[PDB]
Amino acid sequence: VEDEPLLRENPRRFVVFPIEYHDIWQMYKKAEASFWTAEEVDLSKDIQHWEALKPDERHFISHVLAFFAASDGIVNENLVERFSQEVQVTEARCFYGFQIAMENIHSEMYSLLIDTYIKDPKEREYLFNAIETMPCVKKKADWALRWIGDKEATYGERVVAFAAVEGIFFSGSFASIFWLKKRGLMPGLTFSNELISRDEGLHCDFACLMFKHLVHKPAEQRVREIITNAVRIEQEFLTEALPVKLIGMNCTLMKQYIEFVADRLMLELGFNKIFRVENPF
């Protein structure tokens, strides 16, 4: 780990200037400039829209929200107990410091959404504790938590795993909400989804930038394996556990979109595409 510019001991770690890595610094500034709070999302005119929905459309959205409820918390857990601690480069710690704060805002946003659409407290506890109630989302959670507690996996494998969590595990639900936007529905849900997605894309690109700054990283086959496993888990979630059919989407094109996102991630990582499919949406 001493030959790793990103992980090796750094005595100038506590001071910001002079900037050592301008690429990392610019990433941080883009994140900082993107700051927003949950309060900025108007949900007053949304309780009505939630009613104008079909029993299946509410069933879908509520389940997606169930996954998003703790997801950002899990990510922050990793960033606090791991990434932010391991990396010694000031610029990177700055990016991670902001990522943690934004993930907590994302976490609040999703809770606010659930709280706003599900008035019945009985249903609430069922969704809030989705990682302890809904087996479907329990799997995506365990996958992520495993990478947090895995003491064998190198930073290289781990940073790739969370890039998958924030890119691939978010992609399906993201696309679903953007579909609703086109259909003119839930302006509160789709608007927050636009701000959050802008952050995730940023969290993903940073993950790829950290990967590039790693000297000894996992082989391509291992990266394809991790990405591919996340792809399947994400497809199984949106074409089986919770079919996007419930909102008028083709379960086939959704699977293809997931792969398209996995391919973009691979390119960003500096590798060749895995699936070689176009973005259907």
Place this chain on the structure above:
Amino acid sequence: VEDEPLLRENPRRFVVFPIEYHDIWQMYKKAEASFWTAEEVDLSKDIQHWEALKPDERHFISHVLAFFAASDGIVNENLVERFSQEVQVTEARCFYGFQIAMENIHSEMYSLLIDTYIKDPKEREYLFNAIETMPCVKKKADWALRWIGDKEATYGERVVAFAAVEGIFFSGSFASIFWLKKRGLMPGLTFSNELISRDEGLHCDFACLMFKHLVHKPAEQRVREIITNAVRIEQEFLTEALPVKLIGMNCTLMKQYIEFVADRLMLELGFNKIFRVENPF
């Protein structure tokens, strides 16, 4: 640690709602609402003011800035490797997530200040690495770093130590800059100092709130001891190592102010005042 509501295992840790502690949550919202970036501080009209200063007034300010250069970094180091990891209460992790992001902005601000006033790169490296060059600030730094690596000290003693770092170690330099403001000087320096101080007061109050949520905490005598040791170190820094006389301040009243701040901290902690002196300024 299992009987500590703040440190015990929490399965609902990843989700924000429902709010368990509204007192902690409100602290977080106050912090969130106080957000600001370094870019918002106009330093264009400051290079001129730095010139209209006396050789001693620049000597003082540059040394205070030397301490502030890494101080926020050290604080963030503790919050990341310790506090944020130990505490399992969602609301508290949210406050700490924001504290970390703001400390990094504070860190940038001070670097920007130094970079802006000291054009010569020779002087810069001497101040940026003050914890490795200036013995005077090296002592205040080691004191803080010790609390970070001390594996024996309980969270109770440690949270009290950093409340002292952010309250007592900041107080002297803070008062000095507010003195300059009265004297109409360095509008860039005094303006940032107002925003930063607003955050520190908030970081200090939160520290006291966490202390209150601790069941088994250090005895009062131990708290007085930690606070008192910080007081002395801070006075020795501003009446010996770097006399506030250099900017037209009475070294005696400054020592009294430090004690007045130590007393406010004690009250906030739920204990009696130690020095019982009025705020001179």
